[PDB]
């Protein structure tokens, strides 16, 4: 609860708390929970936003997306999850949410828990709000948030820059009219098809027959903005710009950042970004361009113009009139210019590559199916029945090869971690990769060049070293790694617990592009609740005496 956020004064929140206050290791205790019932049901031909009527949807409470989780810094939420589907269980995942020693609650299944099983099982997750920001969540049963179990998180708390109007969540997403589990089967032997449609705020117009409506944002004039933008795509990348506006970067991913004024972003899969909008100009319609860089390395859209209306008040109404310039090509690649409100620093100098550190991306085109991502020579393919957390209650260290456990046993430490993209193999793809349980730090990648070139690059020392940066670099739970080329990150072994590794990108992650980070196992036995183990293993019987009865075989790595 807030006592001194005004419109004015933004990095003020309460006593003790404000926009400088390490987030990480200190949390306002509010006392008060936030609570949700996710009700999770299978709707087969379903009326979509832009006209066309979809085969199969799985749905929370009967909407497109999940109800907006609202609450303030400090608070626990809360939510029953009770999955109402006909064969599927499901598993909600809080990205962004560092779920600081709540490991079980993370929504992981085959890592923290096992799936919910359908037709009335249901879990209650509870996590506390140690940062502020925008996130998200999801499924992660496999691909199922590719058909509607998704929605948006919307922690209030202080900001970097003064702002009049809080517009809330802009959630912005392919869409396929084709299912989930069909576009996994299809993508394992298949190049990924461009969307459908995109849709900005759970609504588009159908490029072919007009059908629908773009999504209109109302700005007051002279106000000053807080739009946040979040990327909730299956694969899509997107590049968005605003037609005579400039956009400013408050927030990346879920950590404040001094204020970066820009034409236009690049969101990632998974990421976001809070920025603020003057409504500056002249009292018009305008238009929120969403478009693709990277010659279609990570993305595109069978939209070629997908937009929103950027409506000022008191200004006519109808479509806008002035269709803009390009925005510059991103390359599928984020920003790196981000500079977190709250600092860390790092030692890059004394980085040597080694096996231990090192995590090989490859493309293994020999199998059966054709697409098939291996990371250390593995593809992930997760136990449903048998998650990690089982083998730590256990006591049981004989984890399989396909979990891909990398364990971390450092208490508290920088680890650096070497991420490269198939240097030689045929072809080489950009990958959003994401971190369960922590923020990383972007310390350095290959050289920014074209997404689509298929120029490669091995971390040479020589003359990489000299490129990393260790002085405040860019802090997110998301980032690119290059096409062809290279990625290093440093997370800080604070949260003991399994995390998933992984590309966000729904195919790859289904072909098995991921690791599991068991950061310190020891640590983490002792800090497991017996309401978190009880609730676990209730979960688990459930779901293992649901399992043989299913008519489906798992298609994928489960994630
Ligand atoms: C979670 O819940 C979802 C929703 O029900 C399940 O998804 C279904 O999964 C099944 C099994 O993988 C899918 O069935 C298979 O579909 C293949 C493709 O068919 C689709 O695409 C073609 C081409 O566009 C269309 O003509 C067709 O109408 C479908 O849309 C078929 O090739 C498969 O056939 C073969 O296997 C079956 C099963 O053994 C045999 O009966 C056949 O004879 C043949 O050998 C098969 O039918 C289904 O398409 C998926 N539906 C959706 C909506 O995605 C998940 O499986 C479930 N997950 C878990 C783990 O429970
Ligand atoms: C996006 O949403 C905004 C806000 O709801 C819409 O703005 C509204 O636009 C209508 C016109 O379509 C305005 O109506 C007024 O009607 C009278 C009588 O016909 C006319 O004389 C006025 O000039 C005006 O057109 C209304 O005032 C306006 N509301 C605000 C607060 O600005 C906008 O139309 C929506 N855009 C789309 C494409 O849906
Ligand atoms: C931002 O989004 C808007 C809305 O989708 C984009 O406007 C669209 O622009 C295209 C051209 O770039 C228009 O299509 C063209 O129409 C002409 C007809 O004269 C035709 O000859 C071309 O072959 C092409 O089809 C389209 O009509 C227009 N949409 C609307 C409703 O105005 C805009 O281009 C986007 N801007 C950026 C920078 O991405
Ligand atoms: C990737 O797999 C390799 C095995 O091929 C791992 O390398 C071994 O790592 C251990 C340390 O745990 C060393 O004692 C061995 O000497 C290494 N063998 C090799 C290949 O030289 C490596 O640890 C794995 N990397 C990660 C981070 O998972
Ligand atoms: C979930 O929603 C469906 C459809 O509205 C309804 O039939 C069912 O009773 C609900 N289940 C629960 C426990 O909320
Ligand atoms: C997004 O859509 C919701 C529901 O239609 C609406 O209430 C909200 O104002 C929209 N957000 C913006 C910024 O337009
Ligand atoms: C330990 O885990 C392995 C892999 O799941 C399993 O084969 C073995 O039976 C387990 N040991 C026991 C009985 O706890
Ligand atoms: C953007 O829109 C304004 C409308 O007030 C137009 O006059 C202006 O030329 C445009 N900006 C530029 C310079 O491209
Ligand atoms: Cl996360
Ligand atoms: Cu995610
Ligand atoms: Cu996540
Ligand atoms: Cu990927
Ligand atoms: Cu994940």
Not at 144 to 159: E, R
Not at 234 to 250: A, G, Y
Not at 311 to 316: D, E, N, T, V, W
Request: aromatic letters at 10%; hydrophobic letters at 35%.
């Amino acid at each position: 609860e807030p006592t001194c956020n005004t419109p004015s004064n933004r990095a003020c929140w309460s006593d003790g708390f404000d926009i400088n206050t390490d987030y990480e290791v200190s949390t306002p205790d509010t006392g008060v929970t936030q609570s949700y019932v996710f009700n999770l049901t299978e709707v087969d031909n379903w009326m979509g936003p832009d006209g066309v009527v979809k085969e199969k949807v799985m749905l929370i409470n009967g909407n497109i997306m999940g109800p907006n989780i609202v609450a303030n810094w400090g608070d626990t939420v809360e939510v029953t999850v009770i999955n109402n589907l006909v064969t599927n269980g499901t598993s909600i995942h809080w990205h962004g949410i560092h779920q600081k020693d709540t490991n079980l609650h993370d929504g992981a299944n085959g890592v923290t828990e096992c799936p919910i099983p359908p037709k009335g099982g249901q879990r209650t997750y509870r996590w506390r709000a140690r940062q502020y920001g925008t996130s998200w969540y999801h499924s992660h049963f496999s691909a199922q948030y590719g058909n509607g179990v998704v929605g948006t998180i919307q922690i209030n708390g202080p900001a970097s820059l003064p702002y009049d109007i809080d517009l809330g969540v802009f959630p912005i997403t392919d869409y396929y009219y084709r299912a989930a589990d069909d576009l996994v089967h299809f993508t394992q032997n298949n190049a990924p098809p461009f969307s459908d449609n995109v849709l900005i705020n759970g609504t588009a117009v159908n490029p072919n027959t007009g059908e629908g409506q773009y999504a209109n944002v109302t700005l007051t004039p002279g106000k000053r903005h807080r739009l946040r933008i979040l990327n909730t795509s299956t694969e899509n990348h997107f590049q968005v710009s605003l037609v005579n506006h400039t956009m400013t970067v408050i927030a990346a991913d879920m950590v404040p950042v001094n204020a970066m004024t820009v034409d236009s972003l690049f969101l990632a899969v998974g990421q976001r970004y809070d920025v603020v909008i003057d409504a500056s100009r002249a009292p018009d319609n305008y238009w929120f361009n969403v478009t693709f860089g990277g010659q279609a390395a990570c993305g595109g859209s069978l939209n070629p113009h997908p937009a929103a209306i950027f409506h000022y008040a008191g200004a006519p109404g109808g479509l806008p009139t002035d269709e803009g310039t390009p925005p510059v090509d991103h390359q599928c690649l984020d920003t790196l210019d981000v500079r977190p409100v709250v600092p860390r620093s790092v030692p890059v100098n004394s980085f040597v590559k080694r096996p231990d550190n090192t995590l090989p991306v490859a493309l293994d085109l020999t199998g059966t199916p054709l697409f098939v991502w291996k990371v250390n020579g593995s593809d992930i393919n997760v136990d449903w029945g048998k998650p990690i957390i089982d083998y730590i209650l256990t006591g049981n260290t004989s984890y399989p090869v396909s979990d891909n456990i990398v364990q971390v046993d450092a208490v508290d430490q920088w680890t650096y971690w070497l991420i490269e993209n198939d240097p030689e193999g045929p072809f080489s793809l950009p990958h959003p990769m994401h971190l369960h349980g922590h923020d990383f730090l972007v310390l350095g990648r290959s050289p920014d060049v074209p997404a689509a070139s298929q120029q490669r690059f091995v971390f040479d020392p020589a003359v990489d070293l000299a490129r990393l940066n260790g002085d405040n670099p860019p802090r997110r739970d998301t980032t690119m790694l290059p096409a062809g080329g290279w990625l290093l990150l440093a997370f800080r072994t604070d949260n003991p617990g399994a995390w998933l590794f992984h590309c966000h990108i729904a195919w790859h992650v289904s072909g098995g592009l991921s690791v599991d980070f068991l950061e310190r196992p020891a640590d983490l036995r002792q800090r497991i609740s017996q309401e978190d183990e009880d609730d676990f293993n209730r979960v688990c019987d459930e779901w293992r005496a649901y399992w043989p009865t299913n008519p489906y075989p798992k298609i994928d790595s489960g994630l």
